[PDB]
Amino acid sequence: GHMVNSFSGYLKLTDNVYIKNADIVEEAKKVKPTVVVNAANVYLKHGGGVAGALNKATNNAMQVESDDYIATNGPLKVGGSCVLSGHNLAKHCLHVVGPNVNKGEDIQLLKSAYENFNQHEVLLAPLLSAGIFGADPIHSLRVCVDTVRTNVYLAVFDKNLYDKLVSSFLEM
């Protein structure tokens, strides 16, 4: 009766990368993923964007657990990750820190960030360093496709952005 990692309605971009116009929180509730990726900062302060939406869906349990991890281990490295509980959304949450290009952090660390995905067979994920961190989403998708070899299901909330990413990609 096994309905874990039940992804549907994704467009297959490569052997291992899939994309969908969806809210990652709503996807997590339907799919019951082994791993959901959070686009974190080094402090695991889940204030806005994807981090805030995931944290809100856990009724702040993610922030309480994150605060405990940071009190114990201190801040993450840019390009680094930790595995914590997925709470009510997923078995695990992979918190991954992409570079903040708005603060002149090295865009090369986006490749380090996506390398963390390769330690997990299957992930539900957003694009890293897009939104507040100021990277071009097209660039972020390209680095993802070139770096990740495991099965990644990308949820893109905005329809116009989804359409731009897909047409850009399929051009080649």
Side-chain angles (χ1 to χ4, degrees), residues 31-101:
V31 163
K32 295 154 204 165
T34 307
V35 179
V36 66
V37 176
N38 181 30
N41 58 52
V42 293
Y43 299 113
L44 301 183
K45 301 311 235 158
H46 310 306
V50 166
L54 292 174
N55 179 51
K56 191 165 209 235
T58 74
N59 284 262
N60 209 49
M62 178 180 288
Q63 190 63 75
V64 171
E65 186 200 23
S66 295
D67 286 351
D68 167 49
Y69 172 91
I70 293 290
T72 302
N73 302 104
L76 277 56
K77 301 182 157 142
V78 181
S81 73
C82 63
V83 184
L84 295 175
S85 174
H87 304 280
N88 56 316
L89 299 182
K91 177 153 199 217
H92 303 112
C93 180
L94 185 66
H95 300 268
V96 186
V97 181
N100 188 341
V101 312

Side-chain angles (χ1 to χ4, degrees), residues 20 36 44 63-64 80-81 88-89 109 116 131 159-161 163 172:
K20 188 185 191 181
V36 66
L44 301 183
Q63 190 63 75
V64 171
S81 73
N88 56 316
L89 299 182
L109 291 170
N116 295 288
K159 175 60 179 315
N160 290 338
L161 180 51
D163 288 339
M172 310 96 186

Side-chain angles (χ1 to χ4, degrees), residues 103-172:
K103 288 166 67 191
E105 293 178 347
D106 187 355
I107 192 54
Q108 175 86 99
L109 291 170
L110 188 53
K111 185 160 187 72
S112 300
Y114 277 119
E115 278 168 353
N116 295 288
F117 286 34
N118 286 323
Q119 295 300 325
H120 307 277
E121 287 177 24
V122 190
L123 312 93
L124 173 60
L127 286 177
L128 297 174
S129 285
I132 181 180
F133 272 9
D136 191 325
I138 293 179
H139 179 76
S140 184
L141 173 62
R142 158 72 172 282
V143 177
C144 180
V145 161
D146 294 353
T147 306
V148 182
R149 294 177 307 278
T150 56
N151 296 308
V152 53
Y153 295 81
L154 295 169
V156 178
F157 183 89
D158 186 77
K159 175 60 179 315
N160 290 338
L161 180 51
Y162 172 83
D163 288 339
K164 195 197 189 142
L165 289 167
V166 164
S167 59
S168 280
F169 188 83
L170 291 181
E171 268 196 303
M172 310 96 186

